[PDB]
Design an enzyme around this catalytic site. Structure first.
Site, PDB file in Angstrom:
ATOM      1  N   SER A  64       0.865  -1.369  -0.047  1.00 28.33           N
ATOM      2  CA  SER A  64      -0.109  -0.053   0.071  1.00 28.33           C
ATOM      3  C   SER A  64       0.552   1.294   0.130  1.00 28.33           C
ATOM      4  O   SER A  64       0.149   2.348  -0.230  1.00 28.33           O
ATOM      5  CB  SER A  64      -0.788  -0.048   1.024  1.00 28.33           C
ATOM      6  OG  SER A  64      -1.804  -1.033   0.977  1.00 28.33           O
ATOM      7  N   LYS A  67      -0.115   3.245  -2.918  1.00 28.29           N
ATOM      8  CA  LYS A  67      -1.348   4.251  -2.624  1.00 28.29           C
ATOM      9  C   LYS A  67      -0.674   5.728  -3.131  1.00 28.29           C
ATOM     10  O   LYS A  67      -1.487   6.604  -3.266  1.00 28.29           O
ATOM     11  CB  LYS A  67      -2.010   3.903  -1.696  1.00 28.29           C
ATOM     12  CG  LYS A  67      -3.088   2.930  -1.582  1.00 28.29           C
ATOM     13  CD  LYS A  67      -3.692   2.568  -0.308  1.00 28.29           C
ATOM     14  CE  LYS A  67      -4.422   1.238  -0.356  1.00 28.29           C
ATOM     15  NZ  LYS A  67      -4.038   0.063  -0.798  1.00 28.29           N
ATOM     16  N   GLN A 120     -10.254  -5.006   1.435  1.00 26.99           N
ATOM     17  CA  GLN A 120     -10.093  -5.929   0.360  1.00 26.99           C
ATOM     18  C   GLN A 120     -11.608  -6.276  -0.571  1.00 26.99           C
ATOM     19  O   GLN A 120     -12.516  -6.219   0.156  1.00 26.99           O
ATOM     20  CB  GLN A 120      -9.524  -7.086   0.532  1.00 26.99           C
ATOM     21  CG  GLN A 120      -8.303  -7.013   1.362  1.00 26.99           C
ATOM     22  CD  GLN A 120      -7.677  -8.259   1.822  1.00 26.99           C
ATOM     23  OE1 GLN A 120      -6.849  -8.785   1.196  1.00 26.99           O
ATOM     24  NE2 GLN A 120      -8.033  -8.646   2.986  1.00 26.99           N
ATOM     25  N   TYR A 151     -10.336   2.156   6.136  1.00 25.25           N
ATOM     26  CA  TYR A 151      -9.362   2.058   4.901  1.00 25.25           C
ATOM     27  C   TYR A 151      -9.732   0.986   3.953  1.00 25.25           C
ATOM     28  O   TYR A 151     -10.157  -0.257   4.458  1.00 25.25           O
ATOM     29  CB  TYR A 151      -8.151   1.605   5.969  1.00 25.25           C
ATOM     30  CG  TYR A 151      -6.779   1.276   4.992  1.00 25.25           C
ATOM     31  CD1 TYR A 151      -6.205   2.197   4.342  1.00 25.25           C
ATOM     32  CD2 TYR A 151      -5.950   0.154   5.316  1.00 25.25           C
ATOM     33  CE1 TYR A 151      -4.916   2.227   3.763  1.00 25.25           C
ATOM     34  CE2 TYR A 151      -4.836   0.052   4.663  1.00 25.25           C
ATOM     35  CZ  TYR A 151      -4.239   1.066   3.801  1.00 25.25           C
ATOM     36  OH  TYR A 151      -3.125   0.746   3.064  1.00 25.25           O
ATOM     37  N   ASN A 153      -8.833  -0.689   0.064  1.00 21.03           N
ATOM     38  CA  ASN A 153      -8.207  -0.857  -1.295  1.00 21.03           C
ATOM     39  C   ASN A 153      -9.477  -0.594  -2.498  1.00 21.03           C
ATOM     40  O   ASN A 153      -9.038   0.119  -3.390  1.00 21.03           O
ATOM     41  CB  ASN A 153      -7.669  -2.331  -1.729  1.00 21.03           C
ATOM     42  CG  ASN A 153      -6.576  -2.217  -2.609  1.00 21.03           C
ATOM     43  OD1 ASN A 153      -5.584  -1.525  -2.505  1.00 21.03           O
ATOM     44  ND2 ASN A 153      -6.770  -2.977  -3.600  1.00 21.03           N
ATOM     45  N   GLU A 273      -0.443   9.852   5.112  1.00 24.66           N
ATOM     46  CA  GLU A 273      -0.915  10.369   6.297  1.00 24.66           C
ATOM     47  C   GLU A 273       0.101  10.731   7.064  1.00 24.66           C
ATOM     48  O   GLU A 273       1.321  10.752   7.195  1.00 24.66           O
ATOM     49  CB  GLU A 273      -1.391   9.036   6.820  1.00 24.66           C
ATOM     50  CG  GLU A 273      -2.179   7.964   6.017  1.00 24.66           C
ATOM     51  CD  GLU A 273      -2.566   6.665   6.521  1.00 24.66           C
ATOM     52  OE1 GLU A 273      -2.074   6.279   7.664  1.00 24.66           O
ATOM     53  OE2 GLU A 273      -3.247   6.034   5.870  1.00 24.66           O
ATOM     54  N   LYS A 316       3.655   6.220   5.125  1.00 24.31           N
ATOM     55  CA  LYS A 316       2.517   5.159   4.844  1.00 24.31           C
ATOM     56  C   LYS A 316       3.365   3.946   5.074  1.00 24.31           C
ATOM     57  O   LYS A 316       4.540   3.871   4.493  1.00 24.31           O
ATOM     58  CB  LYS A 316       2.263   5.507   3.197  1.00 24.31           C
ATOM     59  CG  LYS A 316       1.425   4.537   2.851  1.00 24.31           C
ATOM     60  CD  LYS A 316      -0.199   4.896   3.383  1.00 24.31           C
ATOM     61  CE  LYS A 316      -1.317   3.854   3.156  1.00 24.31           C
ATOM     62  NZ  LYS A 316      -1.013   2.557   4.039  1.00 24.31           N
ATOM     63  N   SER A 319       1.832  -3.214   2.949  1.00 22.89           N
ATOM     64  CA  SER A 319       2.032  -4.729   3.168  1.00 22.89           C
ATOM     65  C   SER A 319       1.625  -5.613   2.057  1.00 22.89           C
ATOM     66  O   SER A 319       0.676  -5.198   1.585  1.00 22.89           O
ATOM     67  CB  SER A 319       1.564  -4.956   4.429  1.00 22.89           C
ATOM     68  OG  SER A 319       2.014  -4.535   5.410  1.00 22.89           O
ATOM     69  N   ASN A 344       6.309  -9.615   5.976  1.00 19.49           N
ATOM     70  CA  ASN A 344       5.211  -8.609   6.481  1.00 19.49           C
ATOM     71  C   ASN A 344       5.362  -8.701   8.329  1.00 19.49           C
ATOM     72  O   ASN A 344       4.798  -9.435   8.763  1.00 19.49           O
ATOM     73  CB  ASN A 344       4.034  -9.022   6.086  1.00 19.49           C
ATOM     74  CG  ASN A 344       2.803  -8.245   6.469  1.00 19.49           C
ATOM     75  OD1 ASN A 344       3.048  -7.356   7.294  1.00 19.49           O
ATOM     76  ND2 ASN A 344       1.584  -8.548   6.105  1.00 19.49           N
TER      77      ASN A 344
HETATM   78  B1  LIG Z   1      -1.982  -2.129   1.925  1.00 23.69           B
HETATM   79  O1  LIG Z   1      -0.488  -2.723   2.017  1.00 23.69           O
HETATM   80  O2  LIG Z   1      -2.043  -1.632   3.185  1.00 23.69           O
HETATM   81  C1  LIG Z   1      -1.921  -2.137   4.373  1.00 23.69           C
HETATM   82  C2  LIG Z   1      -0.509  -1.578   5.251  1.00 23.69           C
HETATM   83  O3  LIG Z   1      -1.075  -0.371   5.684  1.00 23.69           O
HETATM   84  C3  LIG Z   1      -3.103  -3.288   1.449  1.00 23.69           C
HETATM   85  C4  LIG Z   1      -4.296  -2.978   1.826  1.00 23.69           C
HETATM   86  C5  LIG Z   1      -5.505  -3.736   1.311  1.00 23.69           C
HETATM   87  C6  LIG Z   1      -5.188  -4.710   0.349  1.00 23.69           C
HETATM   88  C7  LIG Z   1      -4.089  -4.970   0.056  1.00 23.69           C
HETATM   89  C8  LIG Z   1      -2.655  -4.163   0.428  1.00 23.69           C
HETATM   90 CL   LIG Z   2      -8.179  -5.694  -2.536  1.00 27.60          CL
END
Ligand SMILES: *[B@@]([O])(O[C][C][O])C1=[C][C]=[C][C]=[C]1
Ligand SMILES: [Cl-]
Length: 363
Positions: A64, A67, A120, A151, A153, A273, A316, A319, A344
């Site tokens: 993430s 993002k 997700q 939060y 995706n 953030e 940020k 993972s 992770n």
């Molecule tokens: B992403 O890596 O956020 C988690 C760490 O803050 C993420 C979120 C939702 C799905 C896949 C990856």
């Molecule tokens: Cl997802």
């Protein structure tokens, strides 16, 4: 003299090594931008099985943290007048006209406040345009848009996708052909070239099973970037100094440095953030905790967008099943940090490493 270099290495080793040991991290790369210069520190193995060591060029999944790249593409679309943050989402995809996305803004999507889009996509949604379209067409908000942060995706994924639609080109193509080259990133990929696979670290999960990220819906937008510590630090330095880029890209980066609301100590921008700086380690861990990722929070909307600059820490976490990344920077101190690992491991531990380094640099 050698004292500064020795002290910096001692500091980074002392911050990193106990955390690697405690979390059984096979390989970890640190990159620091300090006083306009990069500093790299590499630890352990990119692959336990073939013995490849981590270097500043090793590619890691950043999850993430992707993002923030997505937010930069959106910033390009925004400051090029192809979209506005107050546009309704369905303005940018006809398939969504008549759905609940008629009443949801691009800002809501970007900042996870559309009304309960989940962390997700469900397992039932594959990497398929029609399945993604139908998922959004059927979705109903749990609560009013603009009220609670959850939060998500699918939320910021859709934001990214719609920004690409506003530009008239696929998201992935825009990232490869425009965004990454504009930012000077030649070791940053959505789809790692065959010729660069030797640089791609292995990821490791429970029982050290090997884990690299597979395809998924809106993967590119949400979590698909693979990059090196050196390239990710280049991106941090672009964020520290947007004025060093041509104006369209400078403005795109600036658009990711604007806060819209607070949840607790955290101010939410596009991607990034932010926190006041200094703040305690415990408060920074709390802002990066599992409940912040998994539970809804009521927002405190700001009266106008706030510049995320000066004595603030922008961060940020990212993972994937096999990787854990963290990026943090302090605009008013011209200071940035990247920590990429091939496990992770808990966010609190990532933040602990960063905080030890930042504290030590203060001292
Ligand atoms: B992403 O890596 O956020 C988690 C760490 O803050 C993420 C979120 C939702 C799905 C896949 C990856
Ligand atoms: Cl997802």
């Amino acid at each position: 003299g050698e004292a500064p270099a020795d002290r910096l290495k001692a500091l980074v080793d002392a911050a990193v090594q106990p955390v690697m040991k405690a979390n059984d991290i096979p390989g970890l790369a640190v990159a620091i931008s300090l006083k306009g210069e990069p500093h790299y520190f590499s630890y352990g193995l990119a692959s336990k099985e073939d013995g490849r060591r981590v270097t500043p060029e090793t590619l890691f999944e950043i999850g993430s943290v992707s993002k923030t790249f997505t937010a930069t593409l959106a910033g390009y679309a925004l400051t090029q007048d192809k979209m506005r943050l107050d546009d309704r989402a369905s303005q940018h995809w006809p398939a969504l006209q008549g759905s609940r996305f008629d009443g949801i803004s691009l800002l809501d999507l970007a900042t996870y406040t559309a009304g309960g889009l989940p962390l997700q996509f469900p397992d039932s949604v594959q990497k398929d345009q029609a399945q993604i379209r139908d998922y959004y067409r059927q979705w109903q908000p749990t609560y009013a848009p603009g009220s609670q942060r959850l939060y998500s995706n699918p939320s910021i994924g859709l934001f990214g996708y719609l920004a690409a639609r506003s530009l008239g080109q696929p998201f992935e193509r825009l990232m490869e052909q425009q965004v990454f080259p504009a930012l000077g990133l030649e070791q940053t990929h959505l789809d790692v070239p065959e010729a660069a696979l030797a640089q791609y670290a292995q990821g490791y999960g429970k029982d050290d099973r090997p884990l690299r990220v597979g395809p998924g819906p809106l993967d590119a937008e949400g979590y698909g970037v693979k990059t090196s510590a050196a390239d990710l630090l280049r991106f941090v330095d672009a964020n520290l100094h947007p004025e060093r880029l041509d104006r369209p890209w400078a403005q795109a980066l600036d658009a990711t440095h604007r806060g819209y609301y607070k949840v607790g100590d955290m101010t939410q921008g596009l991607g990034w953030e932010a926190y006041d700086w200094p703040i305690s380690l415990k408060r920074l861990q709390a802002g990066n905790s599992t409940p912040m990722a998994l539970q809804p929070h009521r927002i405190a909307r700001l009266p106008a967008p706030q510049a995320l600059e000066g004595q603030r820490l922008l961060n940020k976490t990212g993972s994937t099943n096999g990787f854990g990344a963290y990026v943090a920077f302090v605009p008013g101190r011209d200071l940035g940090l990247v920590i990429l690992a091939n496990r992770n491991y808990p966010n609190a531990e990532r933040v602990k490493i960063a905080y030890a380094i930042l504290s030590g640099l203060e001292q």
